[PDB]
């Protein structure tokens, strides 16, 4: 999945197949440097596109004065009851609306979705 | 403890005129090279610019062994003065101008020679994926 | 003891050295150093805390400030030395990088009027005029003209058609220089009138084109 | 514009030699003069608004500047002239500015001049007609603004028009363009789409690496942290594969260079002509206004990662593209 | 020759070459009657042709509120191509971001080349006239320090903008001549920057010689440009919203001076507009144009 650099020479590593060792080794053209493949996963693709917008949205967001706050809702980690809502505005959100929380108090780091 | 005790004060001296100009030598930290491994470094113009607008070139153990290549700067003391502190026997500090800046940046380890053959090359392997439907 | 080679001697003694950056107001004051040299004297102070850089400017040098340390983590400096001669050395490696910046001691006026002192002359501009300069003048003859008067007077281009052997004896000096010479390099050569320098060069040579056009005189083969 | 634009402008003005003895003209110091009618025996009269509409006269003030002559004979002596107030010819003046002569007159003045105090000016007046400048909407210049368009071949385009200060008379556009996902070829779709970026003066589109390599940073790993400055999310860098793919050993700066010297408007049949134009179109063509001088390659680099950087995010959708109707962008 | 030659012809290009000449730039007053005068002299011309029936060029936009007239636009083939600007609505004359740029590395500014990859996205970047000249640690600590010189007025001018896209990780601060800027009210936690005391003063203008600027200098009205009107909360009513209620924001960092501000001299001439339908308003537009005085 991750991309395999060359310590070497700095560039990109292409994985290759010997039969007799019968393990993947990374293969760079410009040097003979070859490495095991721990992963042994040449390609992944996920259409699944089910990243949480939790993760991409940050604390600094709530500090935003134009988003909209609700006292009703409070912060679980630090019981704060002020809390900043927002919709997610992020690809592939049309299917849900659900809003998004981010505790105001500051270096709280809490996020989580109502 | 015994450094944070002790206070040193120690006059500054700037000389008007420097015989020798002060220029800064810059190495990568990722290269990690190291100056007493070295067996002997021979700096001079790079041979690609043949003065001072020329970079400098460091050849390591020869040239074959290894190369850095200085980067000139444009204004070392435009944005500000850069002033080198000399420890003295007398202990009183000495600062000196910089005149010039320069980077010395590794050759790639792989070298070799490219040319418009290669770029011809590189082409051929594009179309090969062009030629093909699937 | 080579011009090419490089001294090391720095280099693996890694004797320690400041890179310091100085504001450019300073760095004239620096410039203009008390009697041989002295800018004044630095205070260094260690605590547990932290540590503190400051330096004193000389009583001399008027008629404290703090200095902000720098990480020299994630690069490795170095100096090196070029003398008048080209001879090169090592002075030693840099251990630490600290900056000159004033904390409190400058006022908001001060700077910005550091900066406007700096400059010294404001950028031109256009400037209004009452009324209007004159543009009209007389002169009896334009300046030129004249110059290119006297200049004719003083020296004649050319000469009369006299001496046609001597003229020919000078062609012949240009043919053994060179197989070919322009007609042009041949009038500056001889004084004879160009229509009677060509009759001359037509009996003794042949004007040839060379494949580049631009027929240039050459002596005849036969 | 005529109090200093007109000054700044004779002010950044390269020298003009002519040689072999060589002549040298500077234009310095700019002189403006209240605006005047010159009558048939040559008498000047100050110009009266009014007056200008009756007799048809055209409303402009004279202008004059300092020109210092040097000339070398070859013979290491140097000649020095300094002509001052020349004529240069007659700027339009808009009726009420500050030059203008109704300005800085008091209302009875005005009435002297059978000009009315309400009448709020503001217009040339040229043979005796009122004539007033129209402003003119424009995009904003030094600005990226990245569209979707589903006409066009290439996905997501990202324009970034560049000047410093207006001082080229041509503004010059550098676009970088992702190409449509879909692949008509099965192995350019298993490799991915390949981002050719549009640069001006060049035949065909040259993709990003190959320009990202004649700017500088040959090293792969250089190149990514301009285009991507968080290699944490791997979908951004399976984005950027497919550009690895198209160039890898070929790293040598100056072949990058003759690869889009050899593929641009202007051909050079040396090589070391090809190589000239490159670095001369990519220095000063491509993005001006980060830097006019050849030195700041490298913040040009990270300026044309940043656009790389949009248009990644515009695929993944993160970012929304910019909207032309934002009155903002308009200038 | 060339300046009296494009003026007279309308086309903004060099005698020898047509080919480059602008259309539309230089037209001669209208002197039918005097609010024709001032309407033809504030006039903006679209750059897409009058033939282009393309509707988002001539559909009115939501940022366009408080910087155009939308009743005072020309009927006819083309249709809102042509606007005039709003009377509180200034174009910007624009200033050198020299003088700024010193403050911003005087303000923690990183340079790009000594700062890492990793650390570009750490810090805010700052865009000065679409220019990466440095990236900030702080993007609170700098816009704060920004925003109160440019009341002070002593380093930056009012009309200058300072966008802060957070979400977008950017700053943008623009000085580039063009924009287009409205003198907006500043109000703090609960009441207007503006107070009676000034007010009284501004009344007496015979000893005080107050003037438009001695506010700007105050800091109690600020111009907005419309990319920062985007980061900028505004108030419709000051009294209503600074009164407890349930508010849509009670930390409005602007308000409009008056609603009827934004319409044009056109627009404002029509007695009790918003009771009339909004088309009818824009026939008087022309109308009061060709009316005979
Ligand atoms: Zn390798
Ligand atoms: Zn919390």
Same mark, same amino acid.
């Given at each position: 999945?991750?991309?395999?650099?060359?310590?070497?020479?700095?560039?990109?590593?292409?994985?290759?197949?010997?039969?007799?060792?019968?393990?993947?080794?990374?293969?760079?053209?410009?040097?003979?440097?070859?490495?095991?493949?721990?992963?042994?996963?040449?390609?992944?693709?996920?259409?699944?596109?089910?990243?949480?917008?939790?993760?991409?949205?940050?604390?600094?967001?709530?500090?935003?004065?134009?988003?909209?706050?609700?006292?009703?809702?409070?912060?679980?980690?630090?019981?704060?009851?002020?809390?900043?809502?927002?919709?997610?505005?992020?690809?592939?959100?049309?299917?849900?609306?659900?809003?998004?929380?981010?505790?105001?108090?500051?270096?709280?780091?809490?996020?989580?979705?109502? | 403890?015994?450094?944070?005790?002790?206070?040193?004060?120690?006059?500054?001296?700037?000389?008007?005129?420097?015989?020798?100009?002060?220029?800064?030598?810059? !190495? +990568?930290?990722?290269?990690?090279?190291? !100056?007493?491994?070295? +067996?002997?470094?021979?700096?001079?113009?790079?041979?690609?610019?043949?003065?001072?607008?020329?970079?400098?070139?460091?050849?390591?153990?020869?040239?074959?062994?290894?190369?850095?290549?200085?980067?000139?700067?444009?204004?070392?003391?435009?944005?500000?003065?850069?002033?080198?502190?000399?420890?003295?026997?007398?202990?009183? !500090?000495?600062?000196?101008?910089?005149?010039?800046?320069? +980077?010395?940046?590794?050759?790639?380890?792989?070298?070799?020679?490219?040319?418009?053959?290669?770029?011809?090359?590189?082409?051929?392997?594009?179309?090969?994926?062009?030629?093909?439907?699937? | 003891?080579?011009?090419?080679?490089?001294?090391?001697?720095?280099?693996?003694?890694?004797?320690?050295?400041?890179?310091?950056?100085?504001?450019?107001?300073?760095?004239?004051?620096?410039?203009?150093?008390?009697?041989?040299?002295?800018?004044?004297?630095?205070?260094?102070?260690?605590?547990?805390?932290?540590?503190?850089?400051?330096?004193?400017?000389?009583?001399?040098?008027?008629?404290?400030?703090?200095?902000?340390?720098?990480?020299?983590?994630?690069?490795?400096?170095?100096?090196?030395?070029?003398?008048?001669?080209?001879?090169?050395?090592?002075?030693?490696?840099?251990?630490?990088?600290?900056?000159?910046?004033?904390?409190?001691?400058?006022?908001?006026?001060?700077?910005?009027?550091?900066?406007?002192?700096?400059?010294?002359?404001?950028?031109?501009?256009?400037?209004?005029?009452?009324?209007?300069?004159?543009?009209?003048?007389?002169?009896?003859?334009?300046?030129?003209?004249?110059?290119?008067?006297?200049?004719?007077?003083?020296?004649?281009?050319?000469?009369?058609?006299?001496?046609?052997?001597?003229?020919?004896?000078?062609?012949?000096?240009?043919?053994?220089?060179?197989?070919?010479?322009?007609?042009?390099?041949?009038?500056?050569?001889?004084?004879?009138?160009?229509?009677?320098?060509?009759?001359?060069?037509?009996?003794?040579?042949?004007?040839?084109?060379?494949?580049?056009?631009?027929?240039?005189?050459?002596?005849?083969?036969? | 514009?005529?109090?200093?634009?007109?000054?700044?402008?004779?002010?950044?003005?390269?020298?003009? =030699?002519?040689?072999?003895?060589? @002549?040298?003209?500077?234009?310095?110091?700019? @002189?403006?003069?209240?605006?005047?009618?010159?009558?048939? =025996?040559?008498? %000047?009269?100050?110009?009266?608004?009014?007056?200008?509409?009756?007799?048809?006269?055209?409303?402009?003030?004279?202008?004059?500047?300092?020109?210092?002559?040097?000339?070398?004979?070859?013979?290491?002596?140097?000649?020095?002239?300094?002509?001052?107030? #020349?004529?240069?010819?007659?700027?339009?003046?808009?009726?009420?500015? #500050?030059?203008?002569?109704?300005?800085?007159?008091?209302?009875?003045?005005?009435?002297?001049?059978?000009?009315?105090?309400? =009448?709020?000016?503001?217009?040339?007046?040229?043979?005796?007609?009122?004539?007033?400048?129209?402003?003119?909407?424009?995009?904003?210049?030094?600005?990226?603004?990245?569209?979707?368009?589903?006409?066009?071949?290439?996905?997501?385009?990202?324009?970034?028009?560049?000047?410093?200060?207006?001082?080229?008379?041509?503004?010059?556009?550098?676009?970088?363009?992702?190409?449509?996902?879909?692949?008509?070829?099965?192995?350019?779709?298993?490799?991915?789409?390949?981002?050719?970026?549009?640069?001006?003066?060049?035949?065909?589109?040259?993709?990003?690496?190959?320009?990202?390599?004649?700017?500088?940073?040959?090293?792969?790993?250089?190149?990514?942290?301009?285009?991507?400055?968080?290699?944490?999310?791997?979908?951004?860098?399976?984005?950027?594969?497919?550009?690895? =793919?198209?160039?890898?050993?070929?790293?040598?700066?100056?072949?990058?260079?003759?690869?889009?010297?050899?593929?641009?408007?202007? %051909?050079?049949?040396?090589?070391?002509?090809?190589?000239? @134009?490159?670095?001369?179109?990519?220095?000063?063509?491509?993005? %001006?206004?980060?830097?006019?001088?050849?030195?700041?390659?490298?913040?040009?680099?990270?300026?044309?990662?940043?656009?790389?950087?949009?248009?990644?995010?515009?695929?993944?959708?993160?970012?929304?593209?910019?909207?032309?109707?934002?009155?903002?962008?308009?200038? | 020759?060339?300046?009296?030659?494009?003026?007279?012809? &309308?086309?903004?290009?060099?005698?020898?070459?047509?080919?480059? *000449?602008?259309?539309?730039?230089?037209?001669?007053?209208?002197?039918?009657?005097?609010?024709?005068?001032?309407?033809?002299?504030?006039?903006?011309?679209?750059?897409?042709?009058?033939?282009?029936?393309?509707?988002?060029?001539?559909?009115?936009?939501?940022?366009?509120?408080?910087?155009?007239?939308?009743?005072?636009?020309?009927?006819?083939? *083309?249709?809102?191509?042509?606007?005039?600007?709003?009377?509180?609505?200034?174009?910007?004359?624009?200033?050198?971001?020299?003088?700024?740029?010193?403050?911003?590395?005087?303000?923690?500014?990183?340079?790009?080349?000594?700062?890492?990859?990793?650390?570009?996205?750490?810090?805010?970047?700052?865009?000065?006239?679409?220019?990466?000249?440095?990236?900030?640690? $702080?993007?609170?600590?700098?816009?704060?320090?920004?925003?109160?010189?440019?009341?002070?007025?002593?380093?930056?001018?009012?009309?200058?903008?300072?966008?802060?896209?957070?979400?977008?990780?950017?700053?943008?601060?623009?000085?580039?001549?063009?924009?287009?800027?409205?003198?907006?009210?500043?109000?703090?936690?609960?009441?207007?920057?503006?107070?009676?005391?000034?007010?009284? /003063?501004?009344?007496?203008?015979?000893?005080?010689?107050?003037?438009? /600027?001695?506010?700007?200098?105050?800091?109690?009205?600020?111009?907005?440009?419309?990319?920062?009107?985007?980061?900028?909360?505004?108030?419709?009513?000051? $009294?209503?919203?600074?009164?407890?209620?349930?508010?849509?924001?009670?930390?409005?960092?602007?308000?409009?001076?008056?609603?009827?501000?934004?319409?044009?001299?056109?627009?404002?001439?029509?007695?009790?507009?918003?009771?009339?339908?909004?088309?009818?308003?824009?026939?008087?537009?022309?109308?009061?144009? /060709?009316?005979? &005085?």
């Amino acid at each position: 999945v991750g991309i395999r650099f060359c310590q070497e020479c700095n560039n990109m590593l292409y994985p290759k197949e010997d039969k007799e060792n019968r393990i993947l080794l990374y293969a760079c053209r410009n040097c003979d440097y070859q490495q095991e493949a721990d992963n042994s996963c040449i390609y992944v693709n996920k259409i699944t596109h089910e990243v949480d917008e939790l993760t991409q949205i940050i604390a600094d967001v709530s500090q935003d004065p134009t988003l909209p706050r609700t006292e009703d809702h409070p912060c679980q980690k630090c019981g704060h009851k002020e809390a900043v809502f927002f919709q997610s505005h992020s690809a592939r959100a049309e299917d849900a609306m659900r809003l998004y929380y981010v505790c105001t108090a500051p270096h709280c780091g809490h996020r989580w979705t109502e | 403890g015994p450094s944070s005790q002790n206070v040193t004060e120690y006059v500054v001296r700037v000389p008007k005129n420097t015989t020798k100009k002060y220029n800064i030598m810059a !190495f +990568n930290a990722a290269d990690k090279v190291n !100056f007493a491994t070295w +067996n002997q470094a021979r700096l001079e113009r790079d041979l690609s610019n043949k003065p001072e607008d020329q970079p400098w070139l460091l050849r390591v153990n020869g040239k074959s062994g290894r190369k850095f290549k200085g980067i000139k700067k444009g204004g070392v003391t435009e944005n500000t003065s850069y002033y080198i502190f000399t420890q003295c026997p007398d202990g009183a !500090f000495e600062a000196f101008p910089v005149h010039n800046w320069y +980077n010395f940046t590794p050759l790639a380890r792989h070298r070799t020679l490219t040319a418009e053959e290669a770029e011809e090359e590189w082409e051929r392997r594009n179309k090969v994926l062009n030629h093909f439907s699937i | 003891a080579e011009r090419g080679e490089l001294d090391l001697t720095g280099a693996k003694q890694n004797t320690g050295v400041w890179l310091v950056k100085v504001p450019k107001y300073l760095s004239q004051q620096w410039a203009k150093a008390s009697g041989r040299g002295e800018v004044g004297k630095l205070r260094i102070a260690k605590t547990q805390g932290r540590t503190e850089v400051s330096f004193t400017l000389n009583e001399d040098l008027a008629n404290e400030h703090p200095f902000v340390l720098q990480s020299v983590g994630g690069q490795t400096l170095t100096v090196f030395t070029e003398s008048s001669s080209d001879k090169l050395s090592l002075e030693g490696i840099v251990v630490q990088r600290a900056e000159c910046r004033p904390a409190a001691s400058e006022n908001y006026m001060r700077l910005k009027r550091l900066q406007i002192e700096e400059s010294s002359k404001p950028v031109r501009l256009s400037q209004q005029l009452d009324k209007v300069v004159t543009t009209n003048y007389k002169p009896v003859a334009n300046h030129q003209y004249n110059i290119e008067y006297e200049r004719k007077k003083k020296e004649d281009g050319k000469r009369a058609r006299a001496d046609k052997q001597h003229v020919l004896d000078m062609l012949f000096s240009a043919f053994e220089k060179h197989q070919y010479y322009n007609l042009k390099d041949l009038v500056d050569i001889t004084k004879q009138p160009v229509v009677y320098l060509k009759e001359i060069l037509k009996e003794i040579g042949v004007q040839n084109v060379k494949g580049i056009h631009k027929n240039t005189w050459e002596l005849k083969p036969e | 514009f005529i109090q200093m634009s007109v000054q700044r402008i004779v002010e950044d003005a390269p020298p003009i =030699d002519l040689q072999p003895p060589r @002549y040298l003209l500077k234009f310095e110091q700019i @002189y403006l003069s209240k605006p005047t009618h010159w009558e048939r =025996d040559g008498a %000047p009269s100050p110009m009266m608004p009014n007056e200008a509409r009756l007799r048809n006269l055209t409303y402009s003030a004279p202008l004059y500047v300092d020109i210092t002559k040097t000339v070398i004979k070859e013979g290491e002596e140097q000649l020095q002239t300094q002509h001052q107030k #020349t004529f240069i010819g007659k700027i339009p003046i808009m009726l009420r500015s #500050t030059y203008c002569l109704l300005n800085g007159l008091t209302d009875r003045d005005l009435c002297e001049l059978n000009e009315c105090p309400l =009448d709020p000016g503001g217009y040339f007046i040229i043979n005796g007609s009122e004539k007033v400048l129209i402003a003119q909407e424009k995009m904003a210049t030094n600005t990226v603004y990245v569209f979707a368009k589903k006409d066009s071949k290439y996905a997501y385009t990202g324009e970034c028009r560049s000047c410093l200060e207006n001082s080229s008379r041509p503004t010059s556009t550098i676009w970088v363009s992702m190409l449509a996902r879909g692949g008509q070829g099965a192995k350019k779709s298993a490799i991915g789409q390949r981002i050719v970026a549009t640069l001006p003066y060049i035949k065909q589109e040259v993709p990003i690496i190959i320009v990202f390599r004649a700017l500088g940073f040959v090293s792969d790993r250089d190149i990514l942290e301009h285009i991507i400055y968080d290699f944490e999310d791997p979908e951004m860098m399976e984005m950027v594969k497919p550009s690895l =793919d198209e160039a890898f050993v070929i790293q040598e700066q100056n072949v990058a260079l003759n690869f889009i010297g050899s593929r641009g408007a202007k %051909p050079g049949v040396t090589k070391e002509k090809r190589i000239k @134009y490159a670095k001369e179109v990519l220095q000063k063509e491509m993005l %001006p206004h980060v830097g006019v001088s050849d030195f700041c390659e490298t913040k040009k680099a990270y300026f044309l990662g940043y656009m790389v950087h949009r248009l990644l995010l515009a695929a993944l959708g993160r970012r929304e593209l910019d909207d032309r109707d934002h009155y903002g962008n308009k200038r | 020759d060339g300046l009296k030659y494009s003026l007279a012809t &309308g086309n903004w290009g060099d005698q020898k070459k047509a080919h480059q *000449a602008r259309a539309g730039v230089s037209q001669v007053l209208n002197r039918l009657t005097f609010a024709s005068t001032l309407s033809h002299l504030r006039r903006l011309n679209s750059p897409i042709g009058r033939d282009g029936k393309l509707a988002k060029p001539r559909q009115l936009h939501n940022t366009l509120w408080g910087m155009v007239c939308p009743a005072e636009t020309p009927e006819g083939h *083309a249709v809102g191509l042509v606007k005039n600007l709003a009377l509180m609505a200034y174009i910007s004359v624009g200033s050198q971001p020299s003088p700024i740029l010193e403050f911003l590395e005087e303000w923690s500014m990183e340079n790009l080349e000594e700062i890492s990859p990793a650390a570009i996205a750490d810090a805010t970047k700052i865009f000065v006239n679409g220019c990466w000249v440095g990236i900030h640690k $702080d993007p609170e600590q700098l816009m704060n320090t920004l925003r109160k010189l440019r009341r002070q007025m002593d380093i930056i001018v009012s009309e200058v903008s300072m966008i802060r896209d957070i979400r977008e990780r950017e700053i943008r601060i623009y000085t580039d001549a063009g924009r287009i800027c409205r003198p907006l009210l500043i109000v703090e936690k609960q009441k207007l920057l503006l107070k009676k005391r000034h007010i009284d /003063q501004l009344k007496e203008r015979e000893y005080n010689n107050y003037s438009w /600027q001695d506010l700007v200098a105050s800091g109690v009205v600020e111009y907005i440009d419309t990319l920062e009107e985007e980061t900028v909360m505004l108030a419709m009513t000051p $009294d209503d919203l600074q009164e407890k209620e349930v508010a849509y924001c009670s930390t409005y960092t602007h308000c409009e001076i008056h609603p009827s501000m934004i319409l044009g001299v056109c627009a404002s001439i029509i007695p009790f507009p918003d009771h009339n339908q909004s088309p009818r308003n824009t026939y008087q537009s022309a109308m009061g144009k /060709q009316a005979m &005085g």
